[PDB]
Structure 1
Amino acid sequence: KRESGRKVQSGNINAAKTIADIIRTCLGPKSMMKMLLDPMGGIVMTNDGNAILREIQVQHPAAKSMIEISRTQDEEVGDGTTSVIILAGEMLSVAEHFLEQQMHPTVVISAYRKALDDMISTLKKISIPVDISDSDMMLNIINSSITTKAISRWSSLACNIALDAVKMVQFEENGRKEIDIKKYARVEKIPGGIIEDSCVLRGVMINKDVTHPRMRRYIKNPRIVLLLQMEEEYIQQLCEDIIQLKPDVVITEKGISDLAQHYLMRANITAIRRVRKTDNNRIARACGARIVSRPEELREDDVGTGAGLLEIKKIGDEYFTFITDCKDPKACTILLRGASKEILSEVERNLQDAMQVCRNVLLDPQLVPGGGASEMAVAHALTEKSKAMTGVEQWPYRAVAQALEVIPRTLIQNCGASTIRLLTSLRAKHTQENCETWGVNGETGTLVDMKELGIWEPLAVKLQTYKTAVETAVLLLRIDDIVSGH
């Protein structure tokens, strides 16, 4: 019916903590596997935090909010989904203040928000710039994701794809450096070939197939148009104004039936159909064409002058229409080649996340020391800053710092080493030695500096990770009454 009081906040903690305890060991290169029992006996031993919670059906509303936020994190950022849930769960697992001490949530939220502003201030001090102009330096960063993948055979090609494709979409003239992989870097699979034939196309691609030979095979100046008896006459006139301009290809938004394709085939042009509105806007920017209301209102200006060429070359038992150019019309297209669909699927998702890494690094050329170094470094600042924190908020303020130790805690647990012994010595290193280094080795299990090991992560990934974990913990703590109602 209705649940209120401390029962609500104590329940949301157990829910978010339970979801975090599942994926504690799926962090780092030693990500432990999880066996999901399907109702039909099917089993998948995946170790991805997203796919695990995606398939696990939950009933608690608080656990759903913790999952949906990680999903939204996965789209905006291609990394850090597992760390958001572990930190958000660990930040909430400190229930000593909520129940035993009877601290109001508004007091803790004042402490969590104060720590978030200080946690962000501590990361930017330990940051390090990047020489993004160097292709080998940025290549050393993208190799962290290429490891243990099928694209490791030609990783140099895999980085050059994502690195240039993002830079082509990178619009630095407007200042904010807006990047949109899904909008301006459309990716499509091409049957046949191999991973080595994967290249970038400087324009828009149309996956429609050629049904009849009466079409333009090669044109230097693509004129791209953009827009039974009674059916014949109404179609005979709408097609007349199109052919009057002598086009090279007609890309209409809505469908082109058989009789409409008949008159278009008399003009010997490629028949394209079933395209969306935004796609037409991208087609127009590819060649400078004009979208018109109806075929009746077509004018001589409706041309794709300036484009490179039109081509309907058959590649691997499939025709492909290209309106590409030898310039940069605010977009690109990744033509992923592969001898089979099994290899094509892996390279698609692999290079997609690789573009997200370069997207975050290029939005701000500032990295941070991973392997628990950033967490233990930030925790040292709050523990020192809390000494001057006059008030009762000092106790939960310090607890947030110790909650960040979970990241090196899980990395040490998966390696099999002593968690207390290394974490104790790890915290001492950040006190005396520099905080920008002395993290954790995820492969060896012992301590190591991050200057000697290139585990440097982006800054925007950690900022949105801590900001989302704190805002998620602040969210569920503000929930004090779960009620029904339609």
Structure 2
Amino acid sequence: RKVQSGNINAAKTIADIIRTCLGPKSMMKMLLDPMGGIVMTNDGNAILREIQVQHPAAKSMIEISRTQDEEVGDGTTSVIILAGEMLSVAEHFLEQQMHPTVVISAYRKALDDMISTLKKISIPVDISDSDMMLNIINSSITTKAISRWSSLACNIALDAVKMVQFEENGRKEIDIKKYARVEKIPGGIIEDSCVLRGVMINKDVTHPRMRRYIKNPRIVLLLQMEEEYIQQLCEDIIQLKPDVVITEKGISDLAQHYLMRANITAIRRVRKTDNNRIARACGARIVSRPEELREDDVGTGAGLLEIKKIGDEYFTFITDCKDPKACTILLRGASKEILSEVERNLQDAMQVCRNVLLDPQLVPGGGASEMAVAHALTEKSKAMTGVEQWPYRAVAQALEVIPRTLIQNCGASTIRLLTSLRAKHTQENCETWGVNGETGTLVDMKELGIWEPLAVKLQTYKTAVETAVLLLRIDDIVSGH
């Protein structure tokens, strides 16, 4: 049992760090760097990322959180707290002399009940209404510098995921890494930012003889004996008379001598993902090599070709008036610090739209979703025949820590309000009577915008319980390779 208890204190201490780093009143932390420096951040994602830990059970908590950051850019603070609080009940592991398998079956049984309980307090959303989506996304715009342009961030965040979603395939897959490439352009301000309705390539301009502005471009996707192939591979492209030569690999110096002779734009170092968006934008086709081109490899339907030097930096705009399962964001700012604020804050809002569009269902946040769940499992434990009911009730008492931290971070009497918070869920409906993060007192969530998506909490409790299962399944540490 010494190894069973070692994973408790290994995770209980990690949860203690980010216990007060939750909510809009999240407390800051002081991390002493080895060079005497101090970082005064408050995000639990970056705090534990730099802190080196000695126990292996605590190192798994970091690998689990990073995978959560890719799915949803928030809520990861509670992922470790619930997994740390679920394992903090040592009365049922060692003092009661129960097996770990006894408790794993109890948590897995409680997992299926928590999932159904969160869907009972769900609510549909009308994504067609941009005003109803503004109340949802504002949960991340508050307490930020982007609050001055909240309406602009709403238009940039909500409409961008609509371009990535392809609802004809049935699954309605949304991928931010491939179809939502966010790029920056110097010059301008946050107000000057807009969403490009097409593809933008970050290729700088090397030669002066290139088509600067064309309203109907044409895109083509792909000493003696040395210049033999170079002149021929370049002469097969001008048969279609293009305006921008988009190559996958790098172009040689002599092959560019014919690209500048033609006074056409020369683009290179383009991914395979990037060319498919172009082929779907202007209807072109990706050919293996330049020598086997056909008539279909043209840019009919393209918006315009512009490689203008905007903000002392060239940018190839090949946008169009279509949404070819892709999008491109144009972030404008006077400085890099301001650009770094809008670039990262929109990624927190852009991922919230991903959860709503895949499943338009919300949940009452601010401690309301936990009490709605913990109240359902407590009454169910009195009628659950089996020894698993005891650890089944510990989950009802352990999930109360999420609202406990929000009231404790505010400084109000957490013991007085949390006990009365149970009565609101006991008598009245569980979909209301939440907790105000800023004020600290109780308030209903229908009147406030603390509503979180459904996919954020589903991955939370699935990964919070799965983390405790993986840690309680351990009983010995093996050293060797």
TM-score over 0.5 for the pair: yes
How big is each residue's C-alpha offset from its partner over 1:403-429, in whole Å with a ceiling of 9 and x where there is no partner? 100001101111111221111111111
Deviation at 1:290, TM superposition (A): 1.7
Deviation at 1:316, TM superposition (A): 1.2
**DSSP 3-state at the match of 2:382:** helix
How big is each residue's C-alpha offset from its partner over 1:240-271, in whole Å with a ceiling of 9 and x where there is no partner? 11122211111111111221110111111101
Q: What is the aligned counterpart of 1:218 among 205, 213, 220?
A: 213
| CA distance in 1 between partners of 2:276 and 2:476 (Å) | 47
**DSSP 3-state at the match of 1:337:** strand
Matched-pair contact (CA < 8 Å) for 2:281–2:322: no
How big is each residue's C-alpha offset from its partner over 1:164-212, in whole Å with a ceiling of 9 and x where there is no partner? 1111112222232211122111110110000001101111101112222
**DSSP 3-state at the match of 2:236:** helix
| CA distance in 2 between partners of 1:288 and 1:103 (Å) | 65
**DSSP 3-state at the match of 2:387:** coil
How big is each residue's C-alpha offset from its partner over 1:251-306, in whole Å with a ceiling of 9 and x where there is no partner? 11111122111011111110111112222222222222222222222222222222
| CA distance in 1 between partners of 2:16 and 2:8 (Å) | 12
Partner residue, 2:443: 448
**DSSP 3-state at the match of 1:483:** coil
| CA distance in 2 between partners of 1:221 and 1:244 (Å) | 17
Deviation at 1:101, TM superposition (A): 1.1
399-408 or 131-140, larger mean C-alpha shift: 131-140
Give structure 1 regions of 4+ aligned residues with deviation exceeding 4 angstroms.
Answer: none
**DSSP 3-state at the match of 1:122:** helix
Partner residue, 2:234: 239
The answer to whether residue 161 in structure 2 is matched with residue 145 in structure 1 is no
**DSSP 3-state at the match of 2:13:** helix
| CA distance in 1 between partners of 2:401 and 2:284 (Å) | 55
401-410 or 166-175, larger mean C-alpha shift: 166-175
Q: State the TM-score, normalized to the length of structure 1.
A: 0.97
**DSSP 3-state at the match of 1:244:** coil
Matched-pair contact (CA < 8 Å) for 2:86–2:468: yes
Matched-pair contact (CA < 8 Å) for 1:243–1:264: no
| CA distance in 1 between partners of 2:184 and 2:89 (Å) | 48
Q: State the TM-score, normalized to the length of structure 2.
A: 0.98
Deviation at 1:384, TM superposition (A): 0.4
| CA distance in 1 between partners of 2:297 and 2:366 (Å) | 56
Deviation at 1:217, TM superposition (A): 2.0
Matched-pair contact (CA < 8 Å) for 2:83–2:465: yes
339-348 or 166-175, larger mean C-alpha shift: 166-175
Partner residue, 1:81: 76
Matched-pair contact (CA < 8 Å) for 1:375–1:407: yes
The answer to whether residue 395 in structure 2 is matched with residue 420 in structure 1 is no
| CA distance in 2 between partners of 1:302 and 1:419 (Å) | 67
286-295 or 467-476, larger mean C-alpha shift: 286-295
Deviation at 1:15, TM superposition (A): 0.9
Deviation at 1:50, TM superposition (A): 0.3
Deviation at 1:345, TM superposition (A): 0.9
Matched-pair contact (CA < 8 Å) for 2:362–2:452: yes
Q: Give the aligned length.
A: 481
Matched-pair contact (CA < 8 Å) for 1:439–1:447: yes
Deviation at 1:118, TM superposition (A): 0.3
**DSSP 3-state at the match of 2:477:** strand
Unaligned runs of 5+ residues in structure 1 are 1-5
Deviation at 1:29, TM superposition (A): 1.0
**DSSP 3-state at the match of 1:326:** coil
Deviation at 1:55, TM superposition (A): 0.8
| CA distance in 2 between partners of 1:295 and 1:119 (Å) | 58
| CA distance in 1 between partners of 2:170 and 2:5 (Å) | 45
| CA distance in 1 between partners of 2:267 and 2:362 (Å) | 46
Partner residue, 2:322: 327
Deviation at 1:213, TM superposition (A): 2.4
